[PDB]
Design an enzyme around this catalytic site. Structure first.
Site, PDB file in Angstrom:
ATOM      1  N   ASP A   1      22.219  79.180  53.538  1.00 53.83           N
ATOM      2  CA  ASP A   1      22.855  80.561  53.984  1.00 53.83           C
ATOM      3  C   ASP A   1      24.282  80.073  54.573  1.00 53.83           C
ATOM      4  O   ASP A   1      24.094  79.522  55.819  1.00 53.83           O
ATOM      5  CB  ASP A   1      22.109  81.173  55.033  1.00 53.83           C
ATOM      6  CG  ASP A   1      22.949  82.215  55.664  1.00 53.83           C
ATOM      7  OD1 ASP A   1      23.731  82.592  55.055  1.00 53.83           O
ATOM      8  OD2 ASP A   1      22.106  83.033  56.813  1.00 53.83           O
TER       9      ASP A   1
ATOM     10  N   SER B   1      41.198  86.833  50.214  1.00 59.06           N
ATOM     11  CA  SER B   1      41.542  86.915  48.874  1.00 59.06           C
ATOM     12  C   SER B   1      42.602  87.876  48.650  1.00 59.06           C
ATOM     13  O   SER B   1      43.369  88.644  49.573  1.00 59.06           O
ATOM     14  CB  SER B   1      40.390  88.089  48.154  1.00 59.06           C
ATOM     15  OG  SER B   1      40.495  88.451  46.964  1.00 59.06           O
TER      16      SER B   1
END
Length: 330
Positions: A35, A199
């Site tokens: 994770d 992004s």
């Protein structure tokens, strides 16, 4: 040193991925969910409340000649999905894919929430976010990656998740055979303890690319792609009959649909998520309504590039003094 381990989807939907991990002496092999959105290595154990264990493999510290109680230390964690676990702490030898750390904190669960009990395939979590998020008190502990770092050939690990197929986690090296083209690196903020990056924009299907900054985290422990409601509405508007369902808890679509791809930007590079990656199948067995793999982040407080997005790429988690992320097509 390096390590290399195969990671395998738990089910036909790629809900999560499990990676075998050796703990203790002689080795006890548990299947852990790696994770990158959390920083605790915790396991089902001989200490876990018996009614909360249903098929998981457990770690038994009393059977390990290298286990030592970390006296006084406790832990307690709550995840983004509402699940939780807590317990005490041992140090032990932990190996992943041939890479060994001695003195790793292994957080033994005394209690787990129902979602953990109900998932017989996941024996615990191995956190790979920054050690500033580790929950051990009163002495915070280091991740497996932070403990391994100094011994590694390069201070990196890579995630290469499969679509309905096994993939790989590598530590300490970048497998240049595992991706196509070049790796594009992008800046990381560690201010919230995550692999947080920005992004450069998105496209829906064959549509034009929209240049827009989308801050989010690279999180292998989250199944879906969670993005701002503007971006998610733009995607599902291209699917006939798709709608947001408050009863189901997100966007659903007709199972007869063909889904468009979704593209996200990494600097001037582009990662394309094929439409089929976005199909998470019937909302209930036999239903003709299917659950979407792209969902709004608006009720979370962060955008999450989870497995739907990461499995479309070869991802480099660069833990050098200035951390960065790298993405390549594959």
């Amino acid at each position: 040193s390096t390590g290399s381990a195969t990671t395998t989807p738990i089910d036909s939907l790629d809900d999560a991925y499990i990676t075998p991990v050796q703990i203790g002496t002689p080795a006890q092999t548990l299947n852990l969910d790696f994770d990158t959105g959390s920083s605790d290595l915790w396991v089902f154990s001989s200490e876990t409340t018996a009614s909360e264990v249903d098929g998981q493999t457990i770690y038994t510290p009393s059977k390990s000649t290298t286990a030592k109680l970390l006296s006084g230390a406790t832990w307690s964690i709550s995840y983004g999905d509402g699940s939780s676990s807590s317990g005490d702490v041992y140090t032990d030898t932990v190996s992943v894919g041939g890479l060994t750390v001695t003195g790793q904190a292994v957080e033994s669960a005394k209690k787990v929430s129902s979602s953990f009990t109900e998932d017989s395939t996941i024996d615990g979590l191995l956190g790979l976010a920054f050690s500033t998020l580790n929950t051990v008190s009163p002495t915070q502990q280091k991740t497996f990656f932070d403990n391994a770092k100094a011994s590694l050939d390069s201070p990196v690990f890579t995630a290469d998740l499969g679509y309905h197929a096994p993939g790989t986690y590598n530590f300490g090296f970048i497998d240049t055979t595992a991706y196509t083209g070049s790796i594009t690196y992008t800046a990381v903020s560690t201010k919230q303890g995550f692999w947080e990056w920005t992004s450069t924009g998105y496209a829906v299907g064959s549509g034009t690319f929209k240049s827009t900054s989308i801050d989010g985290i690279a999180d292998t422990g989250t199944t879906l792609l969670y993005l701002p409601a503007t971006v998610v509405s733009a995607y599902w508007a291209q699917v006939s009959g798709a709608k947001s369902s408050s009863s189901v808890g997100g966007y659903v679509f007709p199972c007869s649909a063909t889904l468009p791809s979704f593209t996200f930007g990494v600097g001037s590079a582009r990662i394309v998520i094929p439409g089929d990656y976005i199909d998470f199948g019937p909302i209930s067995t036999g239903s003709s309504s299917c659950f979407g793999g792209i969902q709004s982040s608006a009720g979370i407080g962060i955008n999450i590039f989870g497995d739907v997005a990461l499995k479309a790429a070869f991802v480099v988690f660069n833990g050098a003094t200035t951390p960065t992320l790298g993405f390549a097509s594959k």
